[PDB]
Design an enzyme around this catalytic site. Sequence first.
Site, PDB file in Angstrom:
ATOM      1  N   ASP A 292      27.365  10.907 -20.751  1.00  0.00           N
ATOM      2  CA  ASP A 292      28.665  10.338 -21.081  1.00  0.00           C
ATOM      3  C   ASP A 292      29.514  10.166 -19.833  1.00  0.00           C
ATOM      4  O   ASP A 292      30.103   9.102 -19.628  1.00  0.00           O
ATOM      5  CB  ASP A 292      29.384  11.206 -22.109  1.00  0.00           C
TER       6      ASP A 292
ATOM      7  N   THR B 165      32.561   8.489 -30.975  1.00  0.00           N
ATOM      8  CA  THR B 165      31.691   8.034 -32.051  1.00  0.00           C
ATOM      9  C   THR B 165      32.216   8.490 -33.404  1.00  0.00           C
ATOM     10  O   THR B 165      32.146   7.734 -34.379  1.00  0.00           O
ATOM     11  CB  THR B 165      30.263   8.536 -31.832  1.00  0.00           C
ATOM     12  N   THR B 166      32.746   9.715 -33.482  1.00  0.00           N
ATOM     13  CA  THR B 166      33.497  10.112 -34.667  1.00  0.00           C
ATOM     14  C   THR B 166      34.625   9.130 -34.932  1.00  0.00           C
ATOM     15  O   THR B 166      34.863   8.749 -36.083  1.00  0.00           O
ATOM     16  CB  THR B 166      34.060  11.522 -34.499  1.00  0.00           C
TER      17      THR B 166
ATOM     18  N   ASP C 224      29.663  19.934 -35.250  1.00  0.00           N
ATOM     19  CA  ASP C 224      29.969  19.054 -34.128  1.00  0.00           C
ATOM     20  C   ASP C 224      29.550  17.622 -34.432  1.00  0.00           C
ATOM     21  O   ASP C 224      28.532  17.142 -33.925  1.00  0.00           O
ATOM     22  CB  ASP C 224      29.292  19.575 -32.868  1.00  0.00           C
TER      23      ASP C 224
END
Lengths: 508, 517, 73, 74, 513, 73
Positions: free
Chosen positions: E381, E80-81, E47
């Site tokens: 988030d 963020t990925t 993840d």
Amino acid sequence: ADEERAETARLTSFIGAIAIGDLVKSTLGPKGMDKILLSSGRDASLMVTNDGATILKNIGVDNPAAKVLVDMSRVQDDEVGDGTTSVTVLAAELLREAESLIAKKIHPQTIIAGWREATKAAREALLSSAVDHGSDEVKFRQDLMNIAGTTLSSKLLTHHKDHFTKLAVEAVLRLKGSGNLEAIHIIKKLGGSLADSYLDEGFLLDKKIGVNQPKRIENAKILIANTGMDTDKIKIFGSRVRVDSTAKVAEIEHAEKEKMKEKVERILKHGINCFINRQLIYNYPEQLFGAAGVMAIEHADFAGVERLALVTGGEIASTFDHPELVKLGSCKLIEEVMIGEDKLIHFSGVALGEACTIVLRGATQQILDEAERSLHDALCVLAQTVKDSRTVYGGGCSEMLMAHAVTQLANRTPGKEAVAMESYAKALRMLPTIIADNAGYDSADLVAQLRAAHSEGNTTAGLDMREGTIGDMAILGITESFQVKRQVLLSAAEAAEVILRVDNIIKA
Amino acid sequence: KSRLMGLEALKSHIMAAKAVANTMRTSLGPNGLDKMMVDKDGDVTVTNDGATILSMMDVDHQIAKLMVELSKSQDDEIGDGTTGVVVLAGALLEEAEQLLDRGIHPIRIADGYEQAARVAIEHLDKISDSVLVDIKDTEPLIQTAKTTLGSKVVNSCHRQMAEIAVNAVLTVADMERRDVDFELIKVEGKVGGRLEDTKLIKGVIVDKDFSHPQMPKKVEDAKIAILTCPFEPPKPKTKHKLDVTSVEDYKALQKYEKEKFEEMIQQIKETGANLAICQWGFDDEANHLLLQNNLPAVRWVGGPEIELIAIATGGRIVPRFSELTAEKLGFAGLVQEISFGTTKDKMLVIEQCKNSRAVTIFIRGGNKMIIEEAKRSLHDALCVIRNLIRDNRVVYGGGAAEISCALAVSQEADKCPTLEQYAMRAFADALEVIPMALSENSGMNPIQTMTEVRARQVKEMNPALGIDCLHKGTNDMKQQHVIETLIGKKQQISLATQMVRMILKIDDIRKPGESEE
Amino acid sequence: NPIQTMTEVRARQVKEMNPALGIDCLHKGTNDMKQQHVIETLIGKKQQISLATQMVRMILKIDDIRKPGESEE
Amino acid sequence: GTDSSQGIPQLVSNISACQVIAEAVRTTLGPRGMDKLIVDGRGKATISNDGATILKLLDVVHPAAKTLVDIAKS
Amino acid sequence: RDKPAQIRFSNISAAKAVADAIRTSLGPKGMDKMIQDGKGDVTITNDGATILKQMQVLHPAARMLVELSKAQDIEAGDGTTSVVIIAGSLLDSCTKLLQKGIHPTIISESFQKALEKGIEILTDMSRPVELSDRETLLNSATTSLNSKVVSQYSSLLSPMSVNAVMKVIDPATATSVDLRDIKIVKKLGGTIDDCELVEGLVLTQKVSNSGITRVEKAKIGLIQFCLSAPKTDMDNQIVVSDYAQMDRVLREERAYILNLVKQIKKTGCNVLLIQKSILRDALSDLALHFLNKMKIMVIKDIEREDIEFICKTIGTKPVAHIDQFTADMLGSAELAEEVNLNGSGKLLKITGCASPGKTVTIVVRGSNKLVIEEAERSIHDALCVIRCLVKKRALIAGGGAPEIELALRLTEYSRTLSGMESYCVRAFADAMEVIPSTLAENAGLNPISTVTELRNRHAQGEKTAGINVRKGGISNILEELVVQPLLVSVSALTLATETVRSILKIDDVVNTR
Amino acid sequence: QFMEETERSLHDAIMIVRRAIKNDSVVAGGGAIEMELSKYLRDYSRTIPGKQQLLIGAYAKALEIIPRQLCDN
């Protein structure tokens, strides 16, 4: 031990200053590729540095050849300003010149004289295209602006340069006959502003003022004192040695609270409510210093009192004895102004005048420093603007023009040393090469055309290499004091020629 | 370890003594090229001075040490010539090689060079042998204190460096006694001054100043109280040294030395000497008393200096606070701290117009090597000057004597039927390195450059005209004011040939290898 | 500098369309194909066009890259 | 253990041991008789034209070299 | 030197190199990663978001990305990925054009006008929603609570993600909703349905035991002083060589302090937050016994979080030693509430305190940090999502799907720029559509069918449509319940922009020594 | 470096001047007698031998090598 011979002594001379000279090269001239400082040896850091002096000591300077320009360039920026980046590159440009002459085996004497010969002739030539922009004081203020314009350039600052331009201008303007470097006071902090450079009333000061003590003061007349305590007072009673047991290690710390209380009374003999003990106190002291009615305000700046010792008609001295020894500082209102969650005791009611305090609030302490040398250089070079209204056109528009005659000279003027003097008139134009190609232009049509464009007399015409073009120096406002051009050579001039004639290195 | 002999030990001796000469012949003269020399200490030293090179040089090959010696000999007496004798060695050294390669025996070679050096130093006598007094010498002194201070990098704009030397050896030593006192001349220097800052002091300048300028900054003539007595802790050799942490003994002590130091200072005021120089000097507590006593007096003094304050001033010695008498009073013409216009530079000149037994030539400059540059300037200037102030005997340099010497030697070599007829003539050969390296220092082709002087000496037959020593374009020696003590070349030669001669006389080497320390 | 030089008539290609002008083929200070009068048979260019992808179209022809031990032999 | 050797290999080595040493003083002893800088230690560098001194200075690795010292020193 | 050449690749290389194997993202792709370090220490990783923060990288431009990884978190908390995966995409355009010999400053110039073009077209395709509208706050957070840890719990958190904001949100459109704004404090015990929006400034703290104040009208303390006592702040008249003397010094200690702890209470204090540091031990724990017995909350060596918020939201100042009493600068408190739910955790609930119009507190509860973090990471988030909507309104699709709409639309402007950068601007305008394909990346064999199908069909979605990378299949990606706020990716562009541009600014040789 | 060699003359002379004092009987220095002896001895190499003319010849010649060295050095 060791005896080194010339070849390595000359080659190591060549390599190091060249190796360091090309650190900032693409950052020099106008802006090309920047220069990233990777620090992998001492720490792990991603750093961006266009500053030689920064880049100098960061990377190992321990190359004795590098030491020269590392020193010479550092000295030069420290004198005339923004000379490090220059000198580091300039003698690096020089080393390549004689390196052929050395390869040609041209007498070490020959290259020394010819360069130093041509070093005069170019600065001589640099003397002509040097043009007073400061005849009229407002045009001088405009001279101060364009000369500061080339100084603040090429570094990394977001909005900061705008405050420093006028300020390097204003530091001169109000002082009458020199710029204010010291009357300007540098406060570099992280406030509620990611980019700020502004004028500081008095000088701000950091602390959390809690507990019982009133956190504001009115009608302040400061008693200026360098004498005081921290956990132990300086006096006849300031020392007690007693521990006979493990309870005493606990008891010895309680008697420390005995030493603070007796001075709290001592400020009351003068009766002075505003008294700077420049040494710190804590809240529990702030608990105690709030009882008496004579407060000890902690961590008063030396230069900030000097800041006050300027305008207030007061005195900055050491230690202290009685109120008349060091003249009483006076500030209308000493206030605590909170910037963010933290509160700042602010010495105020005193605004600019003979001096200035300048608080820079950046996103980082990094952005705070790059503006200082920008300011520091723009301050000094605008002090050069003071005496010499001359600004000779930047972007190396002098260099090519310095190289113009010397070229034309070297043919004529020496019947030998043209080797050096041409090489001189050669290396001068390297700085335009490294940028004009970084600009996207073709330096070959820069260093010589635009040279013989400006060197044959269009001197405003110069490098706008952030457009990748020829550009108009007076119009671009990219120019700086003729005095910033000469000595950065003269440093770099000898920066090279030392290690040139260095034919041996003994090592212990 | 191993025995090394003959050509083996020859090429042993040959390497560094030849190799070391190279950096020094590239450093030869003012046009001689500087050398950055960096220790393992992180130090950096830029030196065209072979005497400094040799000092900087720790390199192996014991012969390479023996030059560090040999320059220092000529360094004090002759002054300049430290480097040349070295570069002349490697000259006649390699010069010696091919005679053995010829089969000319190791003791055949040395002596041919040696007696031919006699002719040289004898021929040297023909240049200028003059002798004059100091006040005349100063002109040939400063013309040479051009070269010396200048070959030491900036004589320029100084007869201050030049003419205090004219006084220096003059005052400490007579003209005719010719006894070398640079030991009596105090060559003193201070960073933060200027090269344009240079001073003669016939007495002693003591850096320590008055305890307070509130106390009189002028003590009258003499009345210096010579005191070896503590007004601060006198690093006293007997006891375990411990300060007290208690307020009880904090008060008990502070009343103690307020009594003695005052009555010491009053005893000094009682001895009738209104300056107290104290070999164990003044802390502040005695100085408040001293200030309260209104007695001009001197704080901490170097141990031998208060003695040097005695001799250099002719000062009569009051040894200790126990010996006190009002009769013996140290000499000072005027006691005051001296700021030269350089205020960071503050010394107290004990300035002797009566008895001056140590003459301080005090030079200044911006920085360390700068004053050092100026010190070894002022050093060898006077040192060359000392010859010329004693016997002002001048050869004009830059190879003008070399050909002149190489000429006579050469033929007279052939005149000697001895095997050394070659060697004596081989001797005259290696003299030519002197204009040679200088030519290339001056950046000229020597082989032509030197025979100019030859063609000159073929015609002139004397150093007067010459080549450029200063690379100035006027090829001259006399007229270029290239002026070298005629003693020194005789010195310099004899130093080279004979050191090498024993190097040549020593063919027998027990070392683990060719060279060693 | 081609990308530079290419960038130029590019701007033109944004400014103008299908320039009868263009870049100097003669390396003339002026850039046209008109001032240069560089114009080719509107056949030949397309005639030339016909050729290029054909080759790539040729190199793909069948699935056989194998060789008996004979390929260029 | 213990070492020993006999006869011509030893005996020639007996005379081989000696002849090595006498060359140290060989060309020495005189005005044109050479002179010996003999460095038997790192900072220890010694000069003699006399054998006995350098004999005292040099190492004797042989009974021969041992038996020689006094003989010259005599 | 060829070093600036070799290293700028090595810069781009080990930057891109690590970053390239970093694309497994967005869905059950590849197979799980158990990391055992160069020191040989077992970690089991998955993840990549955490992995991005886990990321331990040799080489600096690789270390640039760990930063760049964290750069997207506080800017967005989403994608963020994205900024990490697309980091190679700029690094791509570098070399190819550096190969092309395009001066990297031109390539560096190529980033901004692109970044000027690019984020705009994202805003041009952006889907408008509100910052204060609980539904628009819900949906963006909903999809950002759909694939995030809790959903069933988010049904409680989604409104609290919303409910926290309407406090924090300053009226209508306002620059607002920071991480300092919603106060996120773990509470030991309870569960996520015990996680609740606990309004204002609620200070999580360790209060000694109980017998404490749960009672209304605290004077919430900030205290830099010791109770001045034998063996605390006051001199001990008793030296101990003896067990009668050693038993004497603690008795005079404990008998004394009992007066100050009540006087501590006499201000009205149901809290005194001790100085974080020690004056000797600072406040004796024998003291802190009786402080709480008078119902005054004490956390000795108080954590940093309370000190600020209490000085920030509540606005509390230190006060004089209670021998001097206090300055009444104890911040506004009508309660000190220490609740044990599951019977677990000790707390300070301050309601009736000064508040900016911000600092809503969420008290995140669970039988363990798991259940706690379950709520926490999701709601955070969901806040940060709503935060993005606040900071920049409208919307974009989740997972870089809108970037392909940009790639099509932008490349034209890249093209029609027809500049030196346009080439680069075209080259990198085409480096976007890779990102959904490249997240598909690690799982399998007979492989390659969908790669350009992960591309083409979007390009054949006109400029308005493409495959949903979160949910699957083509739709108009921007609102599919494949969504992130418009703010999220326009930062990923900017974030990765100058980082890679800094690589083009790497020249000569740098290792600081 | 020239000074050592000087006084050894002074030091040697005394030693051998004293040596001239100690034994007043004094011959020619510098190996004058050896050649004579070398002759005088291997004169027995004619006189001695049933065998050792070798030994007497080899004995006779080794005298000369010291000054011959001085000759040759």
